[PDB]
């Protein structure tokens, strides 16, 4: 499921990207609502990444 998400995420970014070039030159009709929402993704920019770790399994195998 995780690798399926990752491929699924790459497919998503491309639909939006290809479309903006087309607006930029060679005009397609646009809406104010879609254009704003896309800008927001840049503006939201994450903060810092921390935590999560394990090691538990080696004891289980070892005792076994």
């Amino acid at each position: 499921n995780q690798v399926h998400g990752l491929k699924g995420l790459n497919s998503k970014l491309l639909d939006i990207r290809t479309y903006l070039e087309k607006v930029a030159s060679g005009k397609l009709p646009i809406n104010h609502h879609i254009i704003y929402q896309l800008q927001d993704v840049f503006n939201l920019l994450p903060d810092a990444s921390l935590q999560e770790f394990v090691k538990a399994f080696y004891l289980k195998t070892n005792d076994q």
Partner: protein, 94 residues
């Protein structure tokens, strides 16, 4: 203009684009968050303005152009990282 992957602007410019008494500045700054022109926080122990969100630029050809390049940079990050992680835990997949 200055934020778009940066997020700070200094507090200091606002007062230079106000030109009015100091007590009145706090009101203006706070009034802007409230109406929906901007989101964020103000930090006066660094005297800088941090914006979480900056309002999208009302329809222009320019607005569309700024977005496209940044997003293309990101597109390259997903593909690379996805393939990388897949090699390892090849066994776990099955």
């Amino acid at each position: 203009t200055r934020p778009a992957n940066h997020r700070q602007l200094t507090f200091e410019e606002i007062a230079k684009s106000a030109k009015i008494t100091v007590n009145k500045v706090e009101l203006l700054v706070m009034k802007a968050l409230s109406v929906g022109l901007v989101r964020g926080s103000i930090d006066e122990v660094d005297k800088r303005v941090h914006m979480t969100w900056v309002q999208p630029r009302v329809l222009d050809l320019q607005q569309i152009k700024g977005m496209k390049d940044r997003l293309e940079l990101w597109c390259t990050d997903v593909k690379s990282m996805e393939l990388l992680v897949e090699h390892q835990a090849q066994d776990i997949l099955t």
